[PDB]
């Protein structure tokens, strides 16, 4: 007698002669896992590794007839621990690279049972998760990350898999903070994979993340636009100037060399040009072709009225035929990528 | 008495019986788990990575009658191996990354029983915990880092955190000596947090953090000031030296830059402008017009007057650029101290 | 019919990063509408209020707004605006909300 005393010996009644190697209704029906997720954060989204890191409540729901009791009203809340003696489905991220149940206390799971035995299971999760990017679009591109859930030794004939709710399985996307990405939208879907051993359920749950151009404007284009405006300074100074009109020059194509090498240290090595290089080597030809403007006047000039009419003419379209040109240029690629 | 067979015998008494599974007073009214911390140290706050590592002695107080004893005088010390043969909250901390309790010759737990069937359970416990930063004033911000406790699977119904001492819950947190930053205040809260599945309780540690300017005054600002200054040595620079005014003009130019590329590494990629970089395009304007005005110089010389304006053109850019430098760095200053 | 309403925050805004819209009538609970996130643009709404209503911000002036479009009758209530701490539980529950505002009332 005494209600702590009933529910041990309950307990023990539920666990005497369970079988943890058998799932519910083995050989029968199989027995629907319904889940729900509860996001804590993505903690990064790295390019150079392709991945991203999510830490998540992930939760589970399925039916055991074996844990059904009579003569207790309540929900039981059993301590973790238990999670050791009971069958859990063999649920796991397809995409995952690295991940851990925290374990700070003690491991981070949850068991509630309910008198017509369906089971409540719950983890604390965080996944490095692969994602390959589409980076032609860099870095005004949008990314389809995504988190694979795939039961890994039951078949279809064995095992179901449905989101808990439909679109409301899934909450925290709206706590999601990054300083590159905002959450476009997120998307649910469910799917059987075929293998060579069985076909398998699966749950896909994807982000639509689209990129900050902030960093990259104060970053990138401000330096390179600033540099390459810092290149017409030649045009409007004296052409006997030979010293200080190559010298401005050759750093300034100096200048955006290293600019150009030195983004593709902190991402990664893809092989193709990004929409950034596009804009970098476009950059490049305007500053390059303004240190041959002064190379060829400087010819005319002494080599070749021509000394005096020529070269006085060259400079003096340079002047608006550069800014002009840039503008156009600068024009075509914020309404190629942005505008379309 | 209290010989060591009397104590063996009492102890394992206390655990015949005894069920890991359920609480304290199951069915009954909430377990009152006491928490109580004392920080040993902030090893390291980043910016980039939004976060901060804490190491500290977190203990737990509770009441379990079933561990009630009587004959011993003692609050009985066992070895902490005892813990996974009883029953302990399953606290956490909501917003850490990775944490791991100290394992160095054997894992740092304690448990004391007392006899009335109160247990104290402690453990040292590292923690890297998430602290999102508001970077919009960098050099000169303040920021708030919390350490959220929580009960994972227990809702209010079978458990009810509290400070244990109230206000003096926390200690340890007047000897934090941060290089970067101060503590400022700190204070405790208490609350109860509903989700889908009920409401949980929670307590919060909340730090106050204000920053030191020392290394930044050092590294960043008096680098960007001198930069901004040796580019008004072209003024003095007589106009007929092409090649020394504008040798004087790129080198300070891209010297800007350098100091940018080095800022590019310090801190996450976020999108907004924050007071460093508003300060460093600020010195960029001047010192970017330190040499469009030898280039309009040089473009009135060589284009009698002509001298004479080329001549007052250096006699304005030598009082104007000092001058309005000093105007823009006064305003700077006093917004971002006022505010 | 149609309407809008419009939410004015000031202070330590960051620590709150999330802003919600609840509403009540005599002798019924607090009902939840819909959320907000600043910097993120995200929303959320209550079932009741799908393709209805929408709620946008000005993250700049520093204000939240429901577009309250598509009336019905059953919309008679005092809209309270709220902000929510960033670690809280979850968004539909009145409890999780710390700051709340004055609730203007609207009748239809």
């Known amino acids: 007698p005494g209600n702590m005393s009933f529910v041990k010996e309950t307990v023990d009644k539920l666990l005497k002669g369970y079988d943890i190697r058998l799932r519910p209704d083995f050989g029968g029906p199989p027995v629907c896992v319904g889940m729900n997720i509860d996001i804590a954060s993505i903690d990064m989204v790295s390019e150079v590794n392709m991945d991203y890191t999510l830490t998540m409540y992930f939760q589970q729901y399925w039916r055991d007839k074996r844990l059904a009791y009579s003569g207790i009203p309540l929900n039981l809340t059993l301590d973790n621990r238990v999670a050791d003696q009971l069958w859990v489905p063999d649920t796991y991220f397809l995409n995952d690279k690295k991940s851990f149940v925290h374990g700070v206390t003690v491991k981070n799971r949850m068991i509630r049972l309910h008198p017509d035995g369906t089971v409540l299971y719950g983890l604390r999760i965080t996944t490095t998760a692969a994602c390959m990017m589409d980076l032609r679009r860099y870095p005004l591109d949008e990314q389809n990350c995504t988190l694979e859930i795939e039961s890994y030794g039951y078949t279809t004939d064995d095992i179901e898999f449905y989101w808990r709710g439909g679109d409301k399985a899934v909450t925290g996307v709206e706590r999601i903070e990054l300083p590159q990405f905002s959450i476009v939208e997120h998307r649910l879907v469910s799917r059987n994979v075929v293998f060579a051993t069985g076909a398998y359920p699966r749950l896909s749950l994807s982000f639509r993340l689209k990129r900050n151009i902030g960093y990259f404007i104060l970053q990138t284009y401000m330096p390179s636009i600033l540099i390459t405006i810092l290149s017409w300074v030649s045009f409007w100074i004296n052409y006997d100037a030979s010293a200080a009109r190559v010298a401005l020059g050759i750093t300034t194509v100096l200048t955006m060399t290293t600019i150009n090498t030195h983004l593709r240290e902190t991402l990664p090595k893809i092989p193709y040009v990004k929409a950034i290089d596009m804009y970098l080597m476009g950059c490049f030809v305007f500053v390059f072709l303004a240190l041959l403007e002064y190379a060829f006047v400087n010819y005319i000039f002494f080599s070749q009225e021509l000394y005096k009419g020529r070269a006085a003419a060259i400079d003096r379209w340079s002047r608006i035929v550069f800014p002009f040109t840039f503008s156009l240029f600068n024009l075509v690629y914020w309404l190629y990528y942005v505008n379309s | 008495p209290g010989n060591m067979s009397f104590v063996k015998e009492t102890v394992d008494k206390l655990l015949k019986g005894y069920d890991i599974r359920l609480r304290p007073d199951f069915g009954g009214p909430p377990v009152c788990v006491g928490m109580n911390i004392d920080i040993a140290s902030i090893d390291m706050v980043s910016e980039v990575n939004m976060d901060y590592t804490l190491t500290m002695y977190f203990q737990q107080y509770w009441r379990d009658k079933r561990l009630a004893y009587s004959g011993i005088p003692l609050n009985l010390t066992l070895d902490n191996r005892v813990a996974d043969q009883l029953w302990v909250p399953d606290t956490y901390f909501l917003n850490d990354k990775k944490s791991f309790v100290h394992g160095v010759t054997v894992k740092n737990r304690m448990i004391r029983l007392h006899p009335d069937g109160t247990v104290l359970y402690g453990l040292r416990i590292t923690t890297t915990a998430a602290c999102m930063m508001d970077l919009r004033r960098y050099p000169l911000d303040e920021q708030n880092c919390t350490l959220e406790i929580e009960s994972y699977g227990y809702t209010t119904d079978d458990i009810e955190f509290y400070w244990r001492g109230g206000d003096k819950a926390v200690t340890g947190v007047e000897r934090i000596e941060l290089p970067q930053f101060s503590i400022v205040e700190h204070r405790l809260v208490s609350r109860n947090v509903v989700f889908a599945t009920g409401a949980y309780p929670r307590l919060s540690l909340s730090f106050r953090l204000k920053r030191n300017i020392g290394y930044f005054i050092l590294q960043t600002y008096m680098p960007s000031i001198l930069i901004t200054i040796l580019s008004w040595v072209s003024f003095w620079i007589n106009y007929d030296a092409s090649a020394a005014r504008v040798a004087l003009g790129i080198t300070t130019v891209l010297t800007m830059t350098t100091i940018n590329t080095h800022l590019r590494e310090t801190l996450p990629k976020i999108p907004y402008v924050k007071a460093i970089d508003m300060y460093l395009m600020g010195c960029f304007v001047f010192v970017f017009l330190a040499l469009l005005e030898y280039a309009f110089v040089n473009y009135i010389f060589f284009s009698e007057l002509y001298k004479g304006r080329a001549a007052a053109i250096d006699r304005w850019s030598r009082i104007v650029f000092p001058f309005t430098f000093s105007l823009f760095n006064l305003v700077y200053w006093l917004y971002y101290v006022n505010s | 019919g149609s309407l809008r309403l419009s939410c004015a925050a000031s202070?330590?805004?960051?620590?709150?990063?999330?802003m919600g819209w609840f509403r009540q009538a005599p002798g019924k609970e607090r009902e939840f509408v819909g959320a907000?996130?600043?910097?993120?643009?995200?929303?959320s709404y209550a079932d009741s209020v799908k393709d209805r209503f929408t709620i946008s911000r000005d993250n700049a002036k520093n204000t939240v707004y429901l577009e309250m479009n598509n009336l019905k009758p059953e919309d008679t209530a005092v809209y309270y605006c709220?902000?929510?701490?960033?670690?809280?539980?979850?968004?539909?529950?009145?409890?999780?909300?710390?700051?709340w505002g004055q609730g203007t009332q609207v009748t239809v």
């Open positions: 709220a902000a929510k701490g960033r670690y809280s539980g979850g968004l539909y529950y009145p409890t999780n909300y710390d700051y």
């Open positions: 202070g330590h805004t960051f620590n709150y990063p999330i």
């Open positions: 907000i996130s600043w910097s993120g643009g995200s929303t």
